[PDB]
C-alpha cells in the first residue's frame, strides 16, 4: 500500500504483458511463414512437377518432421478446389465422396467444394472433408483466394477438439494466374488452399504457462475486428482478476481484415 | 558532464541492443528455414524411391522461398561421394567433380561433397567439391558429427568475395540409429545442406541505413577464440563502448556484437 510501489506495480505489468504479447505475434509470424512455405511446396511438387511428388504418405512426412517450424500449428492440410461439374471425376479418381465438416456425411450437391486431400497425421480427422462446409472456414478460403494472401478466422471451436482457436488458410494458384490478376482473374486460377489450425486454446495456455510470473498474471487476447462485438481469443473473462488496473498490448496477426489485442492484469 | 552523457550511454545502448535483436532475428530465421530444407531433400530425394526431387524442382522451390532466409545469398546441396563410387556418381551425372580453387577435374581424394542442387543465385557451385575449401570441409565434417547445423569462422566467399559465413546442415540416410554414436553419424551421412550468409552485403543492407546509422559504428566478431576474436561485420581497427549478445546457434563458436560513437 504505497504511491511509489504501485507506479512500479504497473511498470512490472507493463513489461510482462508486452513480452508475451511480442512473443505471441512472434510465433504467429514463424508459423505463417512456413504455413506460407509448404503452399509454394504443394504448387512445386504436386502440381508443378510431372508426375507429382506429393501423395498423402508424404505430405504427413514432411508435415510431421517439420512441425517444430511451426509453433503455434496443432496441424496443416492441403484441400483442393472442386466445382460440381468435376465431382463424380473426382471421387472417382479418389476412391472416396466428399464429406461435410459437421458429421461425416456425404456432402449434398454445392456449387463447389473444397475436401482436403492431404493432411499432417494430428489433422488426420480432415480428409476428404469439405472446408467450404463450415461458414468459418469457407469465409477464409474466399478471402484467401481473392486476396492473394493469409487470412485469418474469427475465434472459433475447432473440428474434434473444440479448442478455442483460428484457421489460417493460403491460396494455391494454378500456373495460368496472370501477372497483376484481377480478383476474377484469382478465382479462376485457383487450384486450392493451405490451411493452419491455430489451437489458441491449447497451444499459447502452453508458451504462457511456462513463462516465470505466470501464476501473478492474467493474460486475454481479443478479436477487436469489429469494436462494438469483441471476441474472446484466449482467455477465461470471467476470472478473478484485478478490477483497478489493466494494461493493452498490441497484436498484429498480419491480415488486415482482422485487428487483436491482448490485456493482462494482476490476480489479486 | 553530465546527464547528457548518461543520456549518450543510453542511447547507445538502446541502438546497438536494437540491432543485435534485428540480426539475431534475421539469423534464426534463416537457420529454421534451411533446417526445413535439409528436411525436405531427406524425404524426398532419400525416402521416397525413386527420388522425387531434381536440379529443376530444388530450383523452382529455393527461389520461391527465397524471402524466407533473409541472410542468404543462396542455398545448395551437397551428396557425399566415396572415391570407389566416384566413377559411377560421375557417370550418372555427366559432369566430373571439379576443386573449389580453380573448376580442375578433382584429383583422388577419400571422399567429395559435390554440390548436386543449387539455387540459381549459387548456380556456379553445381559440380564443385565442398570439401576442397577448408572453411566448407571442416563445417561438413562438424555437421555430419554432431548432428546440427554448424557455423564457419569469417572467409570470403566464392565468387562475389564478400565476407561471410557458410551455415551447413547434415542429412542423413534412414539406416541412422537412434542415439547414433558419432561412428554410426558419419556411416549414415547422405550429404550436406549449405547455405551462404552473405555478411558483407546483406548485414550492410539490414542495418547500414537504420536511423542514425551515421552516428554509430558497428562491429559484429566471431569470438570463439578469445584471444583472436575475427571481424564478422565492419572495419579493421585495431573508450565508450556497448558489447551487444549475439547467439547465432553453434555452440561451438561465439559472436558478440560492439557499437561505439564515431567522437
Ligand atoms: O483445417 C481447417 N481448414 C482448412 C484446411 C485445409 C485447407 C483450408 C482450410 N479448418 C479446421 C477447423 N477445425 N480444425 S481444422
Ligand atoms: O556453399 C558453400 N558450401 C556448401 C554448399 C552445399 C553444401 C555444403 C556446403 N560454400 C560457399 C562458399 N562460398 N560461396 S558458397
New interface residues.
Partial sequence: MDDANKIRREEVLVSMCDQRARMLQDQFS?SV??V??LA??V???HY??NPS?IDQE?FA??TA??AF?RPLLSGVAYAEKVVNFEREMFERQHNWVIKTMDRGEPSPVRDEYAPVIFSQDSVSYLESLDMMSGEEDRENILRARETGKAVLTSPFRLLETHHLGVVLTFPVYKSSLPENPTVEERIAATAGYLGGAFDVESLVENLLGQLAGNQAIVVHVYDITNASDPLVMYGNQDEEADRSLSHESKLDFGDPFRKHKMICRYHQ
Fill in positions: 514463424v511463414n512456413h506460407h512455405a509454394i511446396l504448387s512445386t511438387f508443378h512437377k511428388a508424404t512426412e514432411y518432421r517439420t517450424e
